[PDB]
């Protein structure tokens, strides 16, 4: 399987409007070698996807959001499921590839009473402490602290890419409009200018939060090359017996 194989079927997989959902497993199958994927916990906490695959013959760990289930929102079970897999992959020098499409965390009193804060912290910690090479591709939404959690560049991420359909923001364009222009009460054109200026990957691109805005048909060709140059990655961290993960 050539490492420069193109994937033109990913050019239009993401629907234009955010209401519809797609299957991240299709993207994963298209990108990886021979379209072979060993998925871990495929029937539990299905809003997140974790598994093992190969890129250019090298074992890689795949983490992604599933917009089919619960619109891809993170919750307790998905947080723990992703966190332990990420920790295992980091412990055994296995590179991580992340596909990000997440609107936020699942709201409700059940999540708050169950300790959603602790498990979201678990996932954020697992992504932050990893010293293996990690490559992140944003396919659409990345809102709020979830964007920080899903292996942002600011967590010592190596390479971050955004598809042309991506959008990184503090929160939704609407709610941002009614939270900024509260007293203006003339949001008819404010919404238009806000969506034309911020509802796109440019604010993250111009500040350097994403390395490049790539075409979806080159994703595999972009990833393998990175995994070729990050194989010798080596970082140094302060000494400790062990850290205190929010278990």
């Amino acid at each position: 399987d050539p490492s420069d194989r193109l994937v033109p079927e990913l050019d239009t997989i993401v629907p234009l409007e955010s209401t519809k959902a797609y299957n991240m497993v299709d993207i994963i199958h298209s990108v990886v070698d021979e379209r072979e994927f060993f998925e871990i916990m495929p029937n539990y906490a299905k809003n997140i996807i974790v598994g093992f695959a190969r890129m250019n013959g090298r074992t890689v760990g795949i983490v992604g959001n599933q917009p089919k289930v619960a619109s891809g929102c993170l919750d307790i079970n998905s947080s723990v499921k992703g966190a332990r897999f990420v920790r295992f992959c980091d412990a055994f020098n296995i590179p991580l590839i992340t596909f990000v499409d997440v609107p936020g965390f699942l709201p409700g009193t059940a999540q708050e009473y169950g300790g959603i804060i602790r498990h979201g912290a678990k996932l954020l910690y697992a992504f932050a402490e990893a010293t293996v090479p990690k490559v992140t591709v944003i396919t659409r939404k990345a809102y709020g602290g979830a964007y920080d959690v899903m292996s942002s560049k600011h967590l010592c991420g190596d390479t971050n890419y955004a598809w042309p359909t991506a959008e990184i923001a503090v929160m939704g364009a609407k709610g941002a409009v009614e939270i900024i222009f509260k007293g203006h009460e003339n949001v008819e054109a404010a919404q238009a200018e806000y969506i034309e200026k911020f509802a796109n990957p440019f604010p993250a691109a111009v500040r350097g939060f994403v390395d490049d805005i790539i075409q979806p048909s080159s994703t595999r060709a972009r990833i393998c090359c990175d995994l070729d140059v990050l194989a010798s990655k080596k970082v140094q961290r302060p000494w400790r017996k062990h850290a205190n993960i929010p278990l």
Partner: protein, 673 residues
């Protein structure tokens, strides 16, 4: 192809898909700008990207996007398009469309309004053909209204009676009678269905031809009163009264009959004053007698297959005629340049009613363009989506050769080397038809699919030698995967001790039989013993490429490995058919003999939705005791309405499908006993 020829500067293609791409390509070859109209869904299709400029003309449904007169007219105004090419279907045969186009300043590339009006109705077309001294099918003139008139006509047209309603393209409004009892009861039923469909109640009664052959004469006419007949075509292979395989030169016909047919078609075209490209269809019997049957006043779907044997671009000639220039060729210039065969690759499941439309998205799509003598007309690409709104046709595959055998061999190779992953296609049926003995010999009719497969398409029935070849290929592929699994990189800390196994003893389960296979490897050559029979399989063994070419005992075979699991299951497309084989090691099978059989909850009593789309109506309710052959409900999608029969007798336990509700594929609709 003369750029100096001052033709229109901008042309609007008011269609979509393969015909839109073909028209755009022809216009680009002539240095003409194009305008592409599309719906919201088809915002990234092949034709919109191929053609400069694009106009969204409405939502996904065709009635509001491609049949929307106002949007198309506004697009023409905005783009200042001089001419419009309708292609086939949609507004190709609409008189009000022609009136709107001829209104302001823009020309319509096709027949004039008078010709379309004359050919629209079957009775007027038949009387015009009779005036044009063209052999017509035995039948009465006018509209039949009473059973006495129907039986009176049946007296002279014989017991075989073909009750056909006016209009209804695609096989609609057609019935068959065999007796006066059958005559009048069928005429009652035909009047009922004509009132239900359009209310015209105009029924045509004619003699039913036994074992007919559908022969189409392509005719090209200009505005200067010149008509040319470009050989013939054969479209006998049909299901649901729709053509799938077309053969350009009719092996059934000879020179004299072909000349007579062409002269009659030219005379009829002159009578109608046709000034474009069209086709005149005939039902040739076994005794080489041809009877007129309908005239299509548009570019035919299977027009490329004749092009290969004539070297003429029909779209280019149509555009030149629309400009006003006369025909550039004479009758003697038309000359047969070999043999050409065309197959329509559809997105349908051939195992269900010789084709059942299916939806999905193309994960992989590759055409055999590198193979010799292969031309592909496709309006799709990798990642394209098949939706219920449009025609599920995937592509048209055309092969040209010196003779019929070369063309058929090239077609078989192209079908074997054509990759579609994501949807279900009818390549198995096409390949099985191509290599059929009757088709190769030439004895075919309009009911070839029905009588060749009475129960239905079951797949290729592979022989003993082919079964051994398939088993050898599967075993070699399994062993190749096992060998590749052991090729790690050097560790320098814990060296890998590769096992030195010589013979692999395997149990291979195919269909229901279990075979014992002994496989050995000598580099690139696998020696496989299946039940004593010894074979040698050699190949590059590239396990990642979608297509794998192997040589079994010298014979070259192209196979595809669609699926593969660690449990031993493999799906292999071989000779165009997908076979499932379960491969285990001998010890694995011996231990598997102790495994308990899991309970399977399949005792019939349930009928899911075989086809996606919208259910028009539900004919059953809970507590209804249905019988065999009783249709549960009717579902419409992609201009086709299908009713699935229960196939068993049992009281309906519950009903989950309601009339007018969107129903996906595989959804459980009605439960019964």
């Amino acid at each position: 192809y003369d750029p100096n020829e001052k033709t229109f500067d901008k042309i609007l293609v008011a269609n979509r898909g393969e015909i839109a791409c073909r028209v755009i390509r022809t216009c680009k070859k002539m240095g003409i700008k194009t305008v592409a109209i599309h719906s919201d869904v088809d915002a990234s299709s092949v034709h919109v990207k191929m053609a400069d400029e694009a106009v969204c003309v409405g939502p996904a449904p065709t009635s509001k996007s491609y049949l929307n007169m106002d949007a198309i007219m506004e697009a023409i105004k905005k783009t200042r398009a001089q001419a419009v090419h309708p292609g086939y279907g949609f507004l190709s045969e609409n008189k009000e469309f022609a009136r709107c186009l001829a209104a302001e300043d823009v020309v319509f590339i096709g027949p004039d309004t008078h010709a379309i009006q004359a050919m629209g109705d079957k009775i007027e077309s038949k009387l015009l053909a009779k005036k044009a001294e063209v052999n017509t099918i035995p039948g009465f003139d006018g509209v039949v209204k009473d059973a006495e008139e129907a039986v009176r006509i049946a007296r002279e047209i014989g017991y075989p009676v073909m009750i056909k309603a006016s209009a209804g393209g695609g096989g609609k409004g057609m019935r068959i009678a065999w007796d006066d009892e059958e005559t009048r009861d069928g005429f009652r039923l035909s009047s009922q269905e004509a009132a239900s469909s359009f209310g015209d109640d105009r029924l045509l009664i004619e003699k039913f031809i036994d074992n007919p052959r559908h022969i189409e004469i392509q005719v090209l006419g200009d505005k200067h009163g010149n008509a040319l007949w470009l050989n013939e075509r054969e479209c006998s292979i049909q299901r649901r009264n729709q053509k799938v395989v077309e053969e350009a030169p009719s092996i059934f016909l000879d020179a004299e009959t072909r000349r007579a047919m062409g002269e009659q078609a030219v005379a009829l075209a002159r009578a109608v004053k046709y000034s474009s490209a069209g086709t005149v269809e005939f039902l040739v019997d076994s005794k080489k007698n041809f009877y007129f049957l309908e005239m299509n006043t548009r570019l035919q779907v299977e027009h490329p297959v004749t092009e290969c044997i004539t070297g003429l671009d029909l779209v280019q000639e149509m555009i030149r005629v629309a400009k006003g220039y006369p025909l550039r060729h004479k009758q003697a210039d038309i000359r047969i340049n070999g043999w050409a065969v065309e197959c329509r690759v559809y997105a349908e499941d051939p195992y269900k009613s010789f084709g059942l439309p299916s939806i999905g998205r193309l994960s992989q799509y590759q055409e055999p363009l590198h193979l010799p003598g292969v031309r592909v007309d496709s309006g799709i690409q990798p990642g394209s989506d098949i939706s219920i709104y449009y025609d599920p046709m995937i592509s048209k595959l055309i092969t040209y050769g010196s003779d019929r055998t070369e063309a058929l061999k090239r077609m078989a190779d192209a079908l074997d080397n054509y990759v579609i992953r994501g949807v279900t296609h009818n390549i198995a049926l096409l390949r099985e038809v191509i290599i059929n003995s009757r088709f190769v010999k030439g004895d075919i009719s309009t009911k070839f699919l029905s009588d060749v497969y009475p129960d239905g398409f079951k797949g290729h029935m592979l022989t003993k030698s082919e079964k051994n070849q398939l088993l050898a290929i599967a075993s070699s592929l399994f062993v190749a995967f096992q060998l590749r699994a052991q090729h790690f990189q050097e560790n320098s800390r814990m060296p890998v001790i590769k096992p030195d196994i010589a013979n692999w003893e395997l149990s291979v389960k195919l269909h229901d039989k279990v075979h014992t296979v002994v496989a050995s490897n000598n580099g690139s050559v696998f020696s496989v013993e299946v039940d004593g029979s010894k074979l040698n399989v050699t190949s590059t063994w590239n396990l990642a490429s979608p297509l794998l070419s192997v040589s079994v005992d010298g014979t070259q075979r192209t196979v595809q490995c669609l699926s593969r699991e660690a449990g031993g299951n493999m799906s292999i497309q071989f000779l165009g058919t997908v076979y499932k084989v379960n491969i285990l090691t001998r010890l694995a099978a011996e231990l598997n003999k102790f495994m308990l059989e899991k309970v399977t909850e399949d005792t019939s009593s349930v009928l899911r939705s075989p086809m996606p789309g919208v259910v028009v109506a539900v004919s059953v309710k809970p507590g209804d005791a249905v019988a065999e052959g009783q249709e549960i409900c009717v579902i419409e999608a992609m201009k086709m309405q299908n009713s699935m029969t229960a196939g068993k007798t049992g009281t309906v336990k519950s009903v989950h499908c309601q009339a007018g509700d969107t129903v996906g594929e595989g959804d459980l609709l009605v439960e019964l006993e």
